[PDB]
């Protein structure tokens, strides 16, 4: 297969109830070097941690507020978190691979993405024109972190036919938003392929 390792950013804010619902560990592997000093092993229920927009168990944070991590002691990173609520907000960068959902077949591209309740996805929709049978769904932009762009398939300039279980065949971008939203567990994106 083919993958493209890319990095992104993450915003963590503090809540007036419990602050940050994150739980960082100091190098799990524990053995020669680190390569993973600061990594979340569990979040909290009812905390801006999971509700921040994109937080999963095992956040391979590389930098916090500009400060590195893999290029230094893990303890310092731990200090940042415990003290990452001064400004009621923290910005960090993470690295990951784009995949875990790719299954095409020329003409029809499948993208099964694990959907959630209501977290920052970053998916932007668009319609070409509502004056023809088969109005396909169109993408306009995809934010990092979220599974949307992570899958590394949703390319700008393509078309769709079915989402999860409903088809845009009826013509209605808004519809796709309803079926793509209502599928808060697993959205099936059926794109259309057709090179020059």
Swiss-Prot record:
Which domain of life does the protein's organism represent?
Eukaryota
What residue ranges carry the coiled-coil annotation?
none
Q: Where in the cell is it found?
A: Cytoplasmic vesicle; Perikaryon; Cell projection, Dendrite; Cytoplasm
Q: In which tissues is it expressed?
A: Expressed in brain, testis and retina. In brain highly expressed in the olfactory bulb, cortex and hippocampus and lower level in thalamus, cerebellum and spinal cord. In brain it is found in the perikaryon, dendrites, dendritic shafts, dendritic spines and, excitatory and inhibitory synapses of neurons. In retina, it is most abundant in the plexiform layers than in perikarya.
Q: Which residues form the PDZ domain?
A: 9-98, 110-195
Sum up the protein's function in the record's words: May play a role as a localized scaffold for the assembly of a multiprotein signaling complex and as mediator of the trafficking of its binding partners at specific subcellular location in neurons. Through complex formation with NSG1, GRIA2 and STX12 controls the intracellular fate of AMPAR and the endosomal sorting of the GRIA2 subunit toward recycling and membrane targeting.
Share what the entry says about its subunit structure, partners included. Answer: Interacts with EFNB1, EPHA7, EPHB2, EFNB3, KIF5A, KIF5C, KIF5B and the C-terminal tail of PRLHR. Forms a ternary complex with GRIA2 and CSPG4. Can form homomultimers or heteromultimers with GRIP2. Interacts with GRIA2, GRIA3, GRIPAP1/GRASP1, PPFIA1, PPFIA4, FRAS1, PLCD4, PTPRF and liprins-alpha. Interacts with ATAD1 in an ATP-dependent manner. ATAD1-catalyzed ATP hydrolysis disrupts binding to ATAD1 and to GRIA2 and leads to AMPAR complex disassembly. Interacts with SLC30A9. Interacts with BUD23.
According to its record, what is known about the domains?
PDZ 6 mediates interaction with the PDZ recognition motif of EFNB1 and EPHB2 and with the C-terminus of PPFIA1 and PPFIA4. PDZ 4 and PDZ 5 mediate interaction with PRLHR. PDZ 4 and PDZ 5 mediate interaction with the C-terminus of GRIA2 and GRIA3. PDZ 4, PDZ 5 and PDZ 6 mediate homomultimers. PDZ 7 mediates interaction with PDZ domain of GRASP1. PDZ 7 domain binds CSPG4. PDZ 6 mediates interaction with the C-terminus of liprins-alpha. PDZ 1, PDZ 2 and PDZ 3 mediate interaction with the PDZ-binding motif of FRAS1.
Query: Could you tell me what this protein is called?
Result: Glutamate receptor-interacting protein 1
Q: What residues of the intact protein does this structure contain?
A: 463 to 658 of 1112
């Amino acid at each position: 297969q083919v993958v493209h390792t890319e990095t992104t950013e993450v915003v963590l804010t503090a809540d007036p109830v419990t602050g940050f619902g994150i739980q960082l560990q100091g190098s799990v592997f524990a053995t020669e070097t680190l390569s993973s000093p600061p990594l979340i092993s569990y979040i909290e229920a009812d905390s801006p941690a999971e509700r921040c927009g994109v937080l999963q168990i095992g956040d391979r944070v590389m930098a916090i507020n500009g400060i590195p991590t893999e290029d230094s002691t893990f303890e310092e990173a731990n200090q940042l978190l415990r003290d990452s609520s001064i400004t009621s907000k923290v910005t960090l960068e993470i690295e990951f691979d784009v995949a875990e959902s790719v299954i095409p077949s020329s003409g029809t591209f499948h993208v099964k993405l694990p959907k959630k309740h209501s977290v920052e996805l970053g998916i932007t929709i668009s319609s070409p024109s509502s004056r023809k049978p088969g109005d396909p769904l169109v993408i306009s932009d995809i934010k990092k972190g979220s599974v949307a762009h992570r899958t590394g398939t949703l390319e700008l300039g393509d078309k769709l036919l079915a989402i999860d279980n409903i088809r845009l065949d009826s013509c209605s971008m808004e519809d796709a938003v309803q079926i793509l939203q209502q599928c808060e567990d697993l959205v099936k994106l059926k794109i259309r392929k057709d090179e020059d």
